From Swiss-Prot, chains A, C:
Self-association state and partner proteins as the record states: Homodimer. Homomultimer. Interacts (via GW motifs) with Arabidopsis thaliana AGO1 and AGO4; these interactions inhibit RNA silencing ability of host AGOs. Interacts with host TIP.
The record's free-text note on cofactor binding: Binds Ca(2+). Ca(2+) probably promotes virus assembly and stabilize the virus particle.
Region ranges (P domain, projecting): 188-300
Principal place of residence: virion
Protein name: Capsid protein
Gene Ontology terms: biological process: symbiont-mediated suppression of host innate immune response
PROSITE patterns found in the cross-reference section: ICOSAH_VIR_COAT_S
Motif GW motif positions after renumbering to this chain: 222-223
Biological source species: Turnip crinkle virus (TCV)
Positions of the UniProt region annotated as S domain, virion shell: 31-187
GO cellular component: T=3 icosahedral viral capsid
Keyword Calcium listed: yes
From Swiss-Prot, chains B, D:
Impact upon substituting K263R: In strain: Infectious clone UK
Main location group: virion
UniProt similarity note: Belongs to the icosahedral plant coat protein family.
Name assigned to this protein: Capsid protein
One BP term from GO: symbiont-mediated suppression of host innate immune response
Alphabetized GO MF terms: RNA binding; structural molecule activity
Cofactor stoichiometry and binding remark: Binds Ca(2+). Ca(2+) probably promotes virus assembly and stabilize the virus particle.
Subcellular compartments: Virion
Keyword Nucleotide-binding among record annotations: no
CC per GO annotation: T=3 icosahedral viral capsid
Oligomer and partners: Homodimer. Homomultimer. Interacts (via GW motifs) with Arabidopsis thaliana AGO1 and AGO4; these interactions inhibit RNA silencing ability of host AGOs. Interacts with host TIP.
Function: Capsid protein self-assembles to form an icosahedral capsid with a T=3 symmetry, about 32-35 nm in diameter, and consisting of 180 capsid proteins. Also acts as a suppressor of RNA-mediated gene silencing known as post-transcriptional gene silencing (PTGS), a mechanism of plant viral defense that limits the accumulation of viral RNAs. May suppress other innate immunity by binding to host TIP protein, thereby preventing it to migrate in the nucleus where it could trigger an antiviral response.
Length: 300, 271, 300, 271
C-alpha cells in the first residue's frame, strides 16, 4: 500500500539478464528460427546536436547478426515475423540527457540534420539514460531476396535502425548503455552453400556479402576503405597492374600489419587489420587515376 | 580415495578505461598454481580426478556510483584463443553479466569421466576440463581501481595414490624445466639479458641463483612491489638470495645481464 | 507487487534497537542465564592488508563481558548453549570496502598474515560496511573450569573471535560499525565468593582474573604493561626491592598520574591509568635484570 | 572433515651383542616429523584428530643363521623413561617378540576422544596418544648388521579446518625459530662449536646460511653419507648453500666457529 501520489528517485538501477536458448523448427516450406542478438554500446556527447549510428536489417549482414549468417547461407528468400529492440542502461541518476531510437523503411537515405525533423519519424522513442525502454516494429508479408553482389537497396532490404544521443555534461559517464534485438525469421528455398569472402575490383563490381566499402573523394586520388564490423580477423590482399606511388598506409585504426612490397608493376600485397570502433579504415592508396586490379577481403 | 569440498579465491578485478574490453582466462585442472592454492598439495599424491560440483561467485567492493558491467563465461575447449568482440562473447552458452555493485552466481553442469592430473606436453583435450573467461570493458576516469573478487566452490574425487612430487622449481639457463610451473624465463637479446615472468600471485617468493663466472650486473628490480637481495655476486664463485613479493601476473621482476649462454643454477620456491 | 528483477540502492539505512531484559532461572544443578552484550566499534583502514581485533570467550573475562563477571564469581564450571554475533552499521553507501568476522577454536594462536589464508577458516563471514549480518557459533557439550591464575588456554577457554577490515578510501567515514553478542550460559557448582584484583610478581606468577599483561623485549630491560579493557578505573601499585633507574613513565596512553617516588631501595609507587583504546600501556620501567618485587592491579 | 588410510616406514634396526637391550622410541602424533612423512601436510591444515585403526609390522631381511630376539611394545604415557630391566619390559600389555628371521603383527585398540595437534611446547599428557618402544638384545659375533624394518598401518580423521602453515624453516643463531621442526641447533663451550642435528630421514635436505662476519671454518662434514657445498665463505655478508643426505637419526653436518652468539640467518627445507 505505497503512496501513489508520491514518487522517489534512487541512486541507480540494476537489470539482470542471462543467456536465452534459440528455437529452430521445420515446416512444409522451410525453417523458422527465433533468437536474440546484441548490436553495440553508446557513448556520451557534449554538444547540443545529435550523433547517429545506423544499422541495416538484412539476414546476410555481418555487421548486424552473428549466428544467423551460417543458416542464411543455405537459402535464398526470407520473411520477418517479429522484431523488437531493447535498451539497457549502465549509468546512475546523476547523468542528465536523452537517448533516442527510430526505424525507417528506406535503407538508402541519409540521417536527418536537426532535432526537429528527427521527431517527425513515426514511432520514434526517447528517454533518459538511466532507464530502459522497448521499440516494437510491425511487419508485413512480402518475400525478398538475400543480399549478395550489388543491387538496389529498395529491392532487397527491409529497413534501417537509427540510434542517437545529444546532450550530456562535462563530467559524466563515458558509456551509456547497450542495445539488443529479438527476432523471428522464416526461410523458404534451399540451395547449395556459398562462399564467405568479398572479391572485387575498382570499377564498381562486388561479388559477395557486404563487409567493406570504398570511397574516392579524389584529390590526387587517395582511396578510402571503410569497415562495417568489429570481427578483428580482417585480411585484405590487393593486386596492382601498374606502378603505384604508395600503398598500405594506416589512416586511422588500432593496428596495422603489411607483409610484401608495392612498388612493382605486378605485385601482390597482404595486410591484417584490427578494428575497435565502427567505420574505422586502415587503408589509403594514392594513384593518378582509377586503376585496374583486384582486391579480396576475408573475415578471420 | 578421498573426497573434498572447499572454497578458494582466485583474483581481483581492475578498472578498464580504454575502448577495447579486457579478458582474463583460467584453466581448471587440479595441478594449476594459478587457480588453486590448497588443492595442489593433495593433487600431487594422486593420478586421477573427477568433479561432481562446480560454481562461481562474484562479490562486489565498489561504490554505488561506479558505472559499467562485468561478465563471466565458461567453455569446454581448453585450447582455444580468446574472443575478439563482445558479440562472439555473448553467444557462448550460459554467459552472465551484471553491474559491478551486485553479485551473481554461475553454475556449470558436470559429467562422469576420469582424466589424468599432470603437467607436461600432452593434449589439453585429453587432460583438462574447461576454461573460465572474465571480461571487463567500460569504466570511467573517476572510478575506483578495484571492482570485485571471484571464488570457486567445488567437490572432487581422487583415485590412485603414488609417490609425491617435489614442491620447489629447479632449473638452469639452458632450458630444462621440471617440478611445478611457478615461473617462466624469457630472453630478448643476449646482451640485454633475461626476464623473470612470475605467472602467479603470492608473497615471499624466494629465488636463489648461482653464477659460475663473472657477471656485469644482477639483481635489478623492474616491477616488484617489494624487493630484497641479501647476498652479493662477485667474480667466479658467488650466490644470491632474493625475496620477491608479487601483486599481479607477469610482472617480470628480476633482470640479470650476462653473455649468451652462461652456466649456473636457479631455485624458485613459494613462501 | 514490486519488481523482483530490478533492485535499488538507497543513501543510507537505519537500524533501531532498544534494551533487552536478561533472563535468570534456577534448575537442579545450578542456574541458567540469557543475555546480550556489546564489544567494541570498528575503524577505517586505507591499506590493502587487514588489521585484526581479537576477543577470548571465557565467562571470567573483564574485556568481553560486563555483568556476567559478578554472577560467575560464585561458581566453578560452565557450559555454553547458544552464541550469536551481530554487526550494526553507521555509514552511508558512499563508503566502499569489506568487513569480516571469524571464529576459531584455538585461543593461543596468532592471527593470519594475508587475506588468502583468512578465507580458509570455516564459517567466516564478510560484507560491505553499510549492511548488517549475523554469525552463529555451534556449541558442544563439555564442562570447563573458569579462568583464574595461570593455566593452559587449551584447557579452560572455548575460543576466540577475530574481526577485520582492510580497504577504504582516502576521504571516508572515521568509524564503521559495532558488534554485539547474544549468549546462553549454564553454571554448575557453588563455592565461596572470590576477590576481584590481580596480584603478581615478575617471575611469571599471576593469581587473579586476566586484566593486564607483561612483556620484556629486553634491551637494557624496559618492561611493558598492556591493558585489556576500557574500564577507566585502573589503579596499579608496585613495590621495589632494589634500586631502579626510572619507573612510572608514560609510554602511550590518554592520561597518567603517579604519587610517590621510586628512587629508593624499598619503595611503593601508586598510579592511576586512563585507557581509551585497547592495548594501550601506561607503564615503562627500566631495570638491569628481571627484578624482585610485587605488583597489584585493580579496576575502579 | 576427511578420512585417510596409509602405510609408511619408520626405521631399520641394528644388531646388539651385549645381553642388555637397546631401546628406540617413537611418539605418535600427526604433527611429528620423526614418525610420519606424508600425513604432516594434511595435518598442517587441521586442528583435531582421531585414530580408528593402528597396526605395526616387522619384516625380516636376515638369514636363518642369525639368532636372537627382537621385541616391540606400546605404552599410553608419552612422558616416561624406558625400563631398565627385561622383566619390566615383559610386564606391558601386548608385548610381542620373535627371532629375527620371522615376522609378527601388533594391534593396538583405540578410544574416541578428540585431541589437539601438537605445537612446539605443550604437555604430553594433553595432546599425545602414546609411544612405541623397540628393543634388541641378543646377537652373535658374526652376524649381519641389518635385521629388519617396521611399518605402520593407520586410519585417521580430522575435523576443524584452518589456515595453512609454511613448509620451510627459518631461524637464526639466537634462541628464536618458527615453522615445522626439521632440525635442531646447539652449542658446546666458549670456543665456538655449533651442533646441527636432523630429525628426519631424507636426501632432499637443503640448508642455506648467511654469515654477517668472518668464519674460520664452515660446512665441514661430520657424519653425513654425502655432503655438497657450492658457495664459498667470505668475511663480509655471504651466503652458503649445502645439500645433505641423511640415512639415520641425528646425522648432520655441523661447523660454525665464529662466536658464542653470532648474527646471521639460516633456512632449512626438505625435498
Amino acid at each position: 500500500v505505497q503512496k501513489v501520489t508520491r514518487l522517489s528517485a534512487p541512486v541507480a538501477l540494476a537489470y539482470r539478464e542471462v543467456s536465452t536458448q534459440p528455437r529452430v523448427s521445420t515446416a512444409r516450406d522451410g525453417i523458422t528460427r527465433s533468437g536474440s542478438e546484441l548490436i553495440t554500446t553508446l557513448k556520451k556527447n557534449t554538444d547540443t546536436e545529435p550523433k547517429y549510428t545506423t544499422a541495416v536489417l538484412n539476414p546476410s549482414e555481418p555487421g548486424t547478426f552473428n549466428q544467423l549468417i551460417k543458416e542464411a547461407a543455405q537459402y535464398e528468400k526470407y520473411r520477418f515475423t517479429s522484431l523488437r529492440f531493447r535498451y539497457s542502461p549502465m549509468s546512475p541518476s546523476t547523468t542528465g540527457g536523452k537517448v533516442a531510437l527510430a526505424f525507417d523503411r528506406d535503407a538508402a537515405k541519409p540521417p536527418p540534420n536537426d532535432l526537429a525533423s528527427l521527431y517527425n519519424i513515426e514511432g520514434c522513442v526517447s528517454s533518459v539514460p538511466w532507464t530502459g525502454f522497448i521499440l516494437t516494429v510491425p511487419t508485413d508479408s512480402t518475400d525478398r531476396f538475400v543480399a549478395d553482389g550489388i543491387s538496389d537497396p529498395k529491392l532487397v532490404d527491409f529497413g534501417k535502425l537509427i540510434m542517437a544521443t545529444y546532450g550530456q555534461g562535462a563530467n559524466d559517464a563515458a558509456q551509456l548503455g547497450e542495445v539488443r534485438v529479438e527476432y523471428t525469421v522464416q526461410l523458404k528455398n534451399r540451395t547449395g552453400s556459398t562462399s564467405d569472402a568479398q572479391i572485387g575490383d575498382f570499377a564498381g563490381v562486388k561479388d559477395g556479402p557486404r563487409l567493406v566499402s570504398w570511397s574516392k573523394t579524389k584529390g590526387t586520388a587517395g582511396w578510402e576503405h571503410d569497415c562495417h564490423f568489429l570481427g578483428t580477423g580482417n585480411f585484405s590482399l590487393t593486386l596492382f597492374y601498374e606502378k603505384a606511388p604508395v600503398s598500405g598506409l594506416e589512416n586511422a585504426d588500432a593496428s596495422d600489419f603489411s607483409v610484401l612490397g608495392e612498388a612493382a608493376a605486378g605485385s601482390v600485397q597482404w595486410a591484417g587489420v584490427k578494428v575497435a570502433e565502427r567505420g574505422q579504415g586502415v587503408k589509403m592508396v594514392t594513384t593518378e587515376e582509377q586503376p585496374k586490379g583486384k582486391w579480396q577481403a576475408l573475415r578471420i
